[PDB]
Scaffold this active site. Structure first.
Site, PDB file in Angstrom:
ATOM      1  N   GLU A 183      -8.155   6.001   6.631  1.00 18.12           N
ATOM      2  CA  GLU A 183      -7.989   5.187   7.824  1.00 18.12           C
ATOM      3  C   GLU A 183      -7.569   5.872   9.116  1.00 18.12           C
ATOM      4  OE1 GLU A 183      -5.500   0.987   8.948  1.00 18.12           O
ATOM      5  OE2 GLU A 183      -4.687   2.342   7.444  1.00 18.12           O
TER       6      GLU A 183
ATOM      7  N   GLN B 145       0.771  -1.202   0.000  1.00 18.98           N
ATOM      8  CA  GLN B 145       0.000   0.000   0.000  1.00 18.98           C
ATOM      9  C   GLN B 145       0.821   1.279   0.000  1.00 18.98           C
ATOM     10  OE1 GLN B 145      -2.044   0.275   3.767  1.00 18.98           O
ATOM     11  NE2 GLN B 145      -0.320  -0.707   4.865  1.00 18.98           N
TER      12      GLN B 145
END
Lengths: 206, 6
Positions: free
Chosen positions: A136, A53
């Site tokens: 997030e 990621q």
């Protein structure tokens, strides 16, 4: 506290190869330590052994960071690029095997572009069964990866939007229509309002 | 140190 730390689109499939999108850098407040981040990646939801990621994060003190990570290894910040409120960041990852791949971060506003490659990663292996576009509430721990704490979730604005979202399973584009939708939930309350529409994943702070 | 898991 934090019950659901991921907000956005999650596709559950197999043999995912590439995930890409462009997203805007919002402003943030909530205190020096409050934070949030936007990124694209593979695995991390049903597959818990690893995550490929990259994205950028924001802190309540007005600072920012572009980064990459091959979970479970600790993330790392990129050195040749700047992130500023309003910038447009093209982000993408490419898995070339369960233990190899690459990540690229391109600031379409400053023309700056950084990259990182991964090979024979021993820490963990990807399953390549998840692809996602996420906002997030992340964590901070010691070098090891223990003594972790979720960071205070920074309020932000405007809504962070992932545009031109692209996913491919073995070279074939995959539909963002089968994607599952998750919200960052804290104390059993949503603090994000994420939604998919076309090739755009849009998340606003609630 | 920053760590991004669901």
């Amino acid at each position: 506290t934090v019950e659901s730390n991921w907000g956005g689109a999650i596709l559950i499939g197999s043999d995912f190869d590439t995930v890409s999108a462009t997203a805007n850098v919002p402003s943030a407040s909530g205190g020096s330590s409050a934070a949030g981040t936007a990124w694209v990646g593979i695995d991390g939801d049903t597959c818990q052994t690893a995550i490929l990621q990259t994205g950028f994060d924001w802190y309540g003190d007005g600072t920012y960071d572009a980064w990459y990570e091959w979970y479970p290894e600790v993330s790392d910040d990129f050195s040749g690029i700047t992130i500023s409120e309003g910038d447009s960041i093209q982000m993408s990852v490419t898995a070339t095997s369960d233990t190899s791949g690459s990540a690229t971060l391109e600031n379409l506003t400053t023309g700056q572009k950084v990259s990182k490659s991964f090979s024979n990663e021993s820490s963990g292996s990807l399953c390549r069964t998840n692809a996602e576009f996420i906002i997030e509430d992340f964590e901070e721990c010691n070098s090891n990866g223990s003594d972790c704490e979720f960071v205070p979730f920074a309020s932000f604005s405007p809504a962070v939007e992932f545009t031109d979202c692209s996913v491919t399973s073995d070279g074939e584009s995959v539909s963002l229509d089968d994607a599952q939708i998750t919200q960052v939930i804290i104390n059993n309350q949503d603090v994000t309002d994420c939604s998919v529409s076309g090739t755009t994943v849009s998340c606003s702070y609630v | 140190f920053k760590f991004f898991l669901r």
